[PDB]
């Protein structure tokens, strides 16, 4: 049976980065070549795996996380990196294995008056563990979610980017 990657990459809606969407990808055949055959990604960085040779591998499970961040914040979506999103919204493990994939989505995720639907966590008692997810709405002590307010006129690093993270972990294989 076939892996439903189309629902991940072509999904109308993406979640805020604090409520980052995870879907388990298991017991199926996937063709990632359809991804490489795309020259429109702004970031396609694999850790521990070469992208062009990835059909040739098999794995136990595949998990695909997805969310929307600012363009200059895609930097924190990397092994062991830190900052405001990698500390409080979405952290990768220092031993991450897989690929981070992002593209500009200004035409989908900005509004004229500012889009306040996309949210991020500003500050929490501690940094998150790898793959930890925090949807708490507890007021922080010196409401912890603020709005990106994506506008179409925003400069490059201010604009919204959609990110899909492929964590590689048998049940899922390539061409069969």
């Amino acid at each position, epitope marked *: 049976n076939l892996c439903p990657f189309g629902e991940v990459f*072509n999904a109308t809606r993406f979640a805020s980065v604090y409520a980052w969407n995870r879907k388990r990808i298991s017991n199926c055949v996937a063709d990632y070549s359809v991804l490489y055959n795309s020259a429109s*990604f702004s970031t396609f960085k694999c850790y521990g795996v070469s992208p062009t040779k990835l059909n040739d591998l098999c794995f136990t499970n595949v998990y695909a996380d997805s969310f929307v961040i600012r363009g200059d914040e895609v930097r924190q979506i990397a092994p062991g990196q830190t900052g405001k999103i990698a500390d409080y919204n979405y952290k990768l493990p220092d031993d991450f294995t897989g690929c981070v994939i992002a593209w500009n989505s200004n*035409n*989908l*995720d900005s509004k*004229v008056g500012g889009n306040y639907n996309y949210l991020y966590r500003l500050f929490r008692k501690s940094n998150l563990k790898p793959f930890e997810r925090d949807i708490s709405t507890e007021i922080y002590q010196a409401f912890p979610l603020q709005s990106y307010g994506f506008q*179409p006129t925003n400069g490059v690093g201010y604009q919204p980017y959609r990110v899909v993270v492929l964590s590689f972990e048998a049940t899922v294989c390539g061409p069969k």
Partner: antibody
Amino acid sequence: QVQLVESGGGVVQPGRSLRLSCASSGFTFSTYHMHWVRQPPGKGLEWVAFISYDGSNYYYSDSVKGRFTISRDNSKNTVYLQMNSLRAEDTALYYCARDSSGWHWGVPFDYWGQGTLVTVSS
Amino acid sequence: IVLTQSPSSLSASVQDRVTITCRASQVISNYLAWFQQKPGKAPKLLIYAASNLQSGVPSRFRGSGSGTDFTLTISSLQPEDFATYYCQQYNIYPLTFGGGTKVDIKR
């Protein structure tokens, strides 16, 4: 195959209103953003307006903001440009073009209709 | 965003290398596109994302640049390449076109 056909152009007096239409065929209109760009006679290309695939996002050039309104009817495969308070400087061939930029597979301004000529004159 | 497209016109001969420059008034990453237009005809996309060739566009059209300064090069000009070329930045609203470059025949 992919087709974009603009209609509605004509000769109108300044201060009057005019509505342009762009009818698509041969592709999934509902997931493409649409743009209007105009080309005044003997001049270059000038972006006018944008409407996202839903119709929820949308923007105008400074030269038409407040006078023009863009809309679409995905059930009829068409995008519209309502032009109010027309002025001599709006005289131009008005093109419609599709845009899938923002989708991971997207390409900007990859197909254009042949345009409909708008002439504002007394 | 203002796009400064240079030169505004040039004369060239078949088999020549043509270089057209587009400079943005602020950084736009690689979100620049190049178009060709012939008289009476609609524009045709040549390159998007600053360097990706549109399908069906010959390989003699190359685009380069990121940030502010961009280049379109036609490596070996062919008779069907005489035309007007436009650069465009398509991600930062309001959308913007360069001033055009008309490539005519040298004699």
